Amino acid sequence: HHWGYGKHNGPEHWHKDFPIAKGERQSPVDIDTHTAKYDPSLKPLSVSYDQATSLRILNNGHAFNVEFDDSQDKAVLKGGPLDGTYRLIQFHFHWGSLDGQGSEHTVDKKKYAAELHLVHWNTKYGDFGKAVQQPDGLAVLGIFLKVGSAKPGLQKVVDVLDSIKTKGKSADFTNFDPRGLLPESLDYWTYPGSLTTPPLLECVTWIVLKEPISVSSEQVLKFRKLNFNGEGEPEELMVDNWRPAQPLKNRQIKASFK
Ligand SMILES: [Zn+2]
């Protein structure tokens, strides 16, 4: 009876095993555009993915992760609201059973069809294991997905989901360029928060892009074909794997644009 997204082990039950679920800096949250202040001191974001080296794709039972080689400063994130250099280790998505819901963060209460998360860790702590334990150990880049024209850079990902339908399967996945998943503009919102799935550690500096990328209806429909279950068990489709907004508790969201 591990944690999940069902009616008897979902978001409202997580606090029993993980008390921090009701903490002071939890994620996600809603972005009230009326109260998110433009901050003239915020710097431009720096994203360097040209030397990104991918290795594998996997189904972990609650989403699918594309793992990267993080032994050197290949893909790094710096600048913006940060005071250090962070390395890319993996990315994954969150989506719904229908186009009308699926994102974790919201803008003026409105929900998108899905949300992309690029996870990086602060190099001053040595490795991921030690970084997740510090309040400034991670930096996560979130991008909204809305229905429209197909996204060319996402096709390589969607074409391999056939090989990892059930929980536990994996496959080689080399030479994928994450630059094809970025929008045109880099304006952003930023605030201190946490991981959105257990253990829910409060170790993240969030950077959410204002401009969403466009994907086709046919592309999102394929995310919905994966399974939460393992081979040979009651089929349960991997849909609606998103956590609702949490209380803000006097935290302030800053904007890098007027
Ligand atoms: Zn996530």
UniProtKB/Swiss-Prot annotation:
Changing H117E: Strongly reduced activity. Changing N60A: Reduced activity. Transmembrane segments: none annotated. The record marks Y5, N60, N65 as: Fine-tunes the proton-transfer properties of H-64. Residues 1-257 form the Alpha-carbonic anhydrase domain. Zinc. Can also use cobalt(II) with lower efficiency, but not copper(II), nickel(II) and manganese(II). It catalyses: hydrogencarbonate + H(+) = CO2 + H2O; urea = cyanamide + H2O. Changing A63S: 2-fold decrease in enzyme efficiency, as determined by kcat/KM ratio, and efficiently inhibited by chlorzolamide. GO terms for molecular function: arylesterase activity; carbonate dehydratase activity; cyanamide hydratase activity; zinc ion binding. Optimum pH is 6-8. It is an enzyme of class 4 (lyase). Changing H62W: Impaired activity, rescued by 4-methylimidazole (4-MI). Impaired activity, not rescued by 4-methylimidazole (4-MI). Pfam families: Carb_anhydrase. Its cofactor is Zn(2+); Co(2+). It is found in: Cytoplasm; Cell membrane. Changing H92Y: In OPTB3; partial loss of activity. Changing V119 to A/G/I/L/S: Reduced CO(2) hydrase and p-nitrophenyl acetate esterase activities. Changing Y5F: Enhanced activity. Keywords: Acetylation, Cell membrane, Cytoplasm, Disease variant, Lyase, Membrane, Metal-binding, Osteopetrosis, Phosphoprotein, Zinc. GO terms for biological process: angiotensin-activated signaling pathway; carbon dioxide transport; morphogenesis of an epithelium; neuron cellular homeostasis; positive regulation of cellular pH reduction; positive regulation of dipeptide transmembrane transport; positive regulation of synaptic transmission, GABAergic; regulation of chloride transport. Changing L195A: Reduced CO(2) hydrase activity. Its EC number is 4.2.1.1, 4.2.1.69. Catalyzes the reversible hydration of carbon dioxide. Can also hydrate cyanamide to urea. Stimulates the chloride-bicarbonate exchange activity of SLC26A6. Essential for bone resorption and osteoclast differentiation. Involved in the regulation of fluid secretion into the anterior chamber of the eye. Contributes to intracellular pH regulation in the duodenal upper villous epithelium during proton-coupled peptide absorption. Target of drugs used in treatments against glaucoma disorder and breast cancer. This is Carbonic anhydrase 2.
